[PDB]
Specification:
part of a larger assembly, 5 chains, A mainly beta (275), B mainly alpha (68), C alpha/beta (114), D mainly alpha (88), E alpha+beta (100), C: 114 residues, alpha/beta, 5 strands, 24% strand, globular, E: 100 residues, alpha+beta, 4-stranded antiparallel sheet, 2 helices, binds magnesium ion, RNA-binding, ribosome, antibiotics, protein biosynthesis, 50S ribosomal protein L2, 30S ribosomal protein S18
RNA sequence: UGGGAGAGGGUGGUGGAAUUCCCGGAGUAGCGGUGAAAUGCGCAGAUACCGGGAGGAACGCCGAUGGCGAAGGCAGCCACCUGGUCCACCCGUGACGCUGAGGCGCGAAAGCGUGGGGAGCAAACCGGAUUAGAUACCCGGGUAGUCCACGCCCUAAACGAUGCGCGCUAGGUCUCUGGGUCUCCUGGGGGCCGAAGCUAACGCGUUAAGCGCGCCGCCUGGGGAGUACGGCCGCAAGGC
């Protein structure tokens, strides 16, 4: 669910917040957190290289496990489900019988107290991890590796999920959350289910301040600038674009494709995203 | 030429009796009407329901091409 | 070159098309009301279909066709005549089966079909 | 559904006398049983409205009888809706 | 607890060892889902009316069973979990209806 | 207590036929559509044909003059959860009944909100024809919507244009579903023709519009008008 407010201030009228129903532990596992080096959007030159960033709430980075083939055959109990400020999804605390504790992204349906496991033999049940080739075609899956032993790269955002469409040789065919049809390697691990917190997108920030909390500084339109600043800049009074609409750096921004043509991974993408 | 006559005591509810049932289908695969099967009102429903069950089980066709 | 093969008849209210294939199902040649030389409404006529199946048989015989199996689809007014033309053509007609696609209440039809 | 045994356990617990069936007490208790079963079914199946009618009819029925018993025997009424946990 | 009639269709082109393997998962599954087997009829192969998974043949199994009511559906789901298992049809058991 | 019939309702699964798109093979000069045409599609390889894949939607034969529900309405198949109802036995309760101003719920289609989905179909819209014109009827396209979830709307030729319950007043025939002894008898539904009687007539006639009792709703010339004002409901459209 999402939680609405009564309109006792102009902003609380439209503001909505997460329900936090699935959360069972409001404290991070101390040995799994490290400080998050905030950037402000600036690179090693001190130069802003992504605009309009900074001033967000301080965060502690949780160390998440995106390999999971790291501990094949050793089951684990789901001790708690926690809030993670560095992602849209929720995270699950895993207490391995091994005695090791690691975080995974919390799938939808994952119950606190239940047990999960990784490996070619794993039961096809929510929260288990297997190479793609050992997962039944048609079952939905998340946290998918793109290449073997390189870590979960696909379907990690709240509510996302990939789906297996069929097999072809060493590779299997996934339909990524964007709808793109892609061949991913059979040995790539993935975790069955969809990501939890699917309600994430129905949140209405509600006021200028909330975006500021999220480290999102105000964004300024090209049209509201000057000819030095932006292609859309200047003009007496208000003004339309007067040219094909562009980024501050000059390139066209309505329709213009940007994926590199001669990219080697083209051979593995079957159907570019719908819509 | 009513099919109900040309058979002995048989179970309508029996969906695995492919040999009995196949007599109740037309040459084109369609379930035969009462005017051809000789079943009463009540019997027809039991027959129809089990014929459909069998079709799912691969024992009976959903359709067959019309030869001349 | 193939001796035995298939004879497909797509005959609708507006036209009749005939295609001769190999036993694997690969077309060898085809004809229709347009191929014989007619246009407009005249394509749907029985006489059009007669010429169609023939030109479909004639070209077929020229590639070694001897035996055919006639598969029929469509309920056109030129249908049965197409069948006539294939028999009297010099082809074997080892069988004739109607295989018109009929849904089990699938997609909603256009307005003119309700 | 409600199992034959459970029905009897209820039938027996509210019988005025060992041979008793269909009396006010038995009637109400049986109704109360179907009601609380249905009440649960409809809590999950919020969209099953055709059955809600039955629920209402039952609820209507149980109500009419309790009014009868209360009219005839106040002690026996106030003891029944207490031993079933009803009035509210 | 109620009486049902589990039908199962398996890949005909398996060997007997593979064939047995599937049966092993099956027979344990029934046990795990409270299904106590009664009668049983393994009619082996059979010619199908239409291809199933692009295959003219189908290997038939059949089990009269007694399991809890509320557990039948999940069993059916677990039964279909195999790639060689191609059809699972559980049916409420019913006394025959006789004609003539 | 014991038994039955059924597209009654809800959730989860699941099967094949067909349409569309996509990939491959093979193949060539048109295909499509109509009263006849044209727009359109096609040598940049279409149609027609075979193989594969993807996706949505509706369930052909059975199917009925049939069944079920209070109405709206409900149809492949399976399972679970669940309502109503009929029969037989004649065991239990002892008038506990009927109706029902308000209230409450349910309420086809279209329509609205948020998020999915989107094959076919298709308001709006574009084009081709027809035509005096054609903001239409026909043809080629086509977006909402049609589908799912949750929440709104609450209208109708929501009709049997026939409120509910009950008693009494010839029968003949077709049908569905129970119980007997099964020739047939006896219940409960679905039609038809009809005694008596009703009715302005048409027609109704044990499924009354017959003869009677009870309760509710409603009518009081046509238009103005289901409009106005007020009030209540709705996000709005709008409803009462
Ligand atoms: Mg939630
Ligand atoms: Mg709010
Ligand atoms: Mg508040
Ligand atoms: Mg509130
Ligand atoms: Mg305020
Ligand atoms: Mg305000
Ligand atoms: Mg959140
Ligand atoms: Mg938050
Ligand atoms: Mg909250
Ligand atoms: Mg939450
Ligand atoms: Mg802290
Ligand atoms: Mg530390
Ligand atoms: Mg330390
Ligand atoms: Mg860091
Ligand atoms: Mg950092
Ligand atoms: Mg540095
Ligand atoms: Mg420097
Ligand atoms: Mg420096
Ligand atoms: Mg940038
Ligand atoms: Mg910045
Ligand atoms: Mg989080
Ligand atoms: Mg948003
Ligand atoms: Mg949004
Ligand atoms: Mg922040
Ligand atoms: Mg922004
Ligand atoms: Mg701005
Ligand atoms: Mg300025
Ligand atoms: Mg400057
Ligand atoms: Mg300059
Ligand atoms: Mg410039
Ligand atoms: Mg400018
Ligand atoms: Mg300016
Ligand atoms: Mg200036
Ligand atoms: Mg200007
Ligand atoms: Mg300016
Ligand atoms: Mg100026
Ligand atoms: Mg100006
Ligand atoms: Mg300006
Ligand atoms: Mg301005
Ligand atoms: Mg300008
Ligand atoms: Mg300009
Ligand atoms: Mg790559
Ligand atoms: Mg049987
Ligand atoms: Mg034509
Ligand atoms: Mg009752
Ligand atoms: Mg009371
Ligand atoms: Mg399977
Ligand atoms: Mg009973
Ligand atoms: Mg092609
Ligand atoms: Mg094909
Ligand atoms: Mg019909
Ligand atoms: Mg008695
Ligand atoms: Mg007495
Ligand atoms: Mg009443
Ligand atoms: Mg009222
Ligand atoms: Mg409605
Ligand atoms: Mg609607
Ligand atoms: Mg809308
Ligand atoms: Mg909508
Ligand atoms: Mg809007
Ligand atoms: Mg939408
Ligand atoms: Mg569309
Ligand atoms: Mg026009
Ligand atoms: Mg014109
Ligand atoms: Mg004009
Ligand atoms: Mg049109
Ligand atoms: Mg169209
Ligand atoms: Mg619109
Ligand atoms: Mg809209
Ligand atoms: Mg609109
Ligand atoms: Mg109606
Ligand atoms: Mg009507
Ligand atoms: Mg009626
Ligand atoms: Mg009216
Ligand atoms: Mg009137
Ligand atoms: Mg009334
Ligand atoms: Mg009988
Ligand atoms: Mg009758
Ligand atoms: Mg009459
Ligand atoms: Mg008279
Ligand atoms: Mg009178
Ligand atoms: Mg007269
Ligand atoms: Mg009569
Ligand atoms: Mg009646
Ligand atoms: Mg009158
Ligand atoms: Mg007047
Ligand atoms: Mg007046
Ligand atoms: Mg009004
Ligand atoms: Mg109105
Ligand atoms: Mg007003
Ligand atoms: Mg009204």
């Amino acid at each position: 669910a999402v939680k609405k407010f009564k309109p006792y201030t102009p902003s609380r009228r439209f503001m909505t917040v997460a329900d936090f129903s699935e959360i069972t532990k409001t404290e991070p596992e101390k040995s799994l957190v490290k400080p998050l080096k905030k950037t402000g959007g600036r690179n090693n030159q001190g130069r802003i290289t992504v605009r309009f960033r900074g001033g967000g709430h301080k965060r502690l980075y949780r160390i998440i496990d995106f390999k999971r083939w790291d501990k094949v055959g050793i089951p684990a109990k789901v001790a708690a489900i926690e809030y993670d400020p560095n992602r849209s999804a929720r995270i699950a605390l895993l207490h391995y019988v091994d005695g090791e504790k690691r975080y995974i992204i919390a799938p939808d349906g994952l119950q606190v107290g239940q047990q999960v496991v990784a490996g070619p033999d794993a039961p096809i049940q929510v929260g288990n991890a297997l190479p793609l080739r050992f997962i039944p075609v048609g079952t939905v899956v998340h946290a998918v590796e793109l290449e073997p032993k390189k870590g979960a790269k696909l379907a990690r955002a709240a509510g996302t999920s990939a789906q297996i469409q069929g097999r072809e040789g060493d590779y299997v065919i996934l339909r990524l959350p964007s709808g793109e049809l892609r061949k991913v390697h059979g040995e790539c691990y993935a975790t069955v289910g969809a990501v939890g917190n699917a309600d994430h997108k129905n949140i209405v920030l509600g006021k200028a301040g909330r975006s500021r909390w999220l480290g999102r500084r105000p964004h300024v339109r090209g049209a509201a600038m000057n000819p030095v600043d932006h292609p859309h800049g200047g003009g007496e009074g208000r003004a339309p674009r007067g040219r094909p609409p562009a980024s501050p750096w000059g390139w066209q921004t309505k329709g213009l494709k940007t994926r590199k043509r001669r990219k080697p991974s083209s051979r593995f993408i079957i159907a570019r995203r719908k819509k | 030429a009513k099919v109900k006559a040309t058979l002995g005591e048989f179970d309508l509810r029996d969906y695995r009796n492919v040999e009995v049932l196949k007599r109740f289908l037309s040459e084109t695969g369609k379930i035969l009407p009462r005017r051809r099967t000789g079943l009463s009102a009540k019997e027809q429903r039991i027959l129809a329901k089990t014929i459909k069950r069998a079709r799912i089980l691969g024992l009976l066709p959903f359709t067959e091409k019309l030869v001349r | 070159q193939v001796a035995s093969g298939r004879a497909y008849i797509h005959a609708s209210y507006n036209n009749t098309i005939v295609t001769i294939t190999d036993p694997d199902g690969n077309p060898i040649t085809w004809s229709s009301g347009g191929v014989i030389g007619y246009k407009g409404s005249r394509k749907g006529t029985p006489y059009a279909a007669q010429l169609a199946a023939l030109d479909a048989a004639k070209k077929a015989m020229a590639y070694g066709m001897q035996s055919v199996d006639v598969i029929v689809r469509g309920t056109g007014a030129g249908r049965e005549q197409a069948i006539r033309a294939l028999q009297a053509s010099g082809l074997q007609v080892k069988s004739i089966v109607d295989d018109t696609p009929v849904p089990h209440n699938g997609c909603r039809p256009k307005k003119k079909f309700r | 559904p409600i199992t034959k045994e459970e029905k009897q356990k209820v039938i027996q617990e509210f019988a005025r006398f060992p041979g008793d069936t269909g009396s006010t007490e038995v009637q109400v208790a049986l109704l109360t049983l179907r009601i609380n079963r249905l009440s649960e079914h409809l809590k999950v199946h919020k969209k099953d409205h055709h059955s809600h009618r039955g629920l209402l009819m039952m609820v209507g029925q149980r109500r009419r009888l309790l009014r009868y018993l209360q009219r005839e025997d106040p002690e026996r009424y106030r003891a029944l809706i207490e031993k079933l946990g009803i009035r509210g | 607890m109620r009486r049902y009639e589990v039908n199962i269709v398996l890949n005909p082109n398996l060997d007997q060892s593979q064939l047995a393997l599937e049966k092993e998962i099956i027979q344990r599954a029934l046990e795990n889902y409270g299904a106590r087997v009664e009668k049983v009829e393994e009619l082996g192969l059979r010619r199908l009316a239409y291809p199933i998974a692009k295959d003219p043949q189908g290997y038939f199994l059949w089990y009269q069973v007694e399991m809890p009511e509320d557990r039948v559906n999940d069993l059916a789901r677990e039964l279909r979990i195999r790639d060689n298992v191609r059809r699972v049809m559980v049916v409420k058991s019913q006394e025959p209806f006789l004609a003539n």
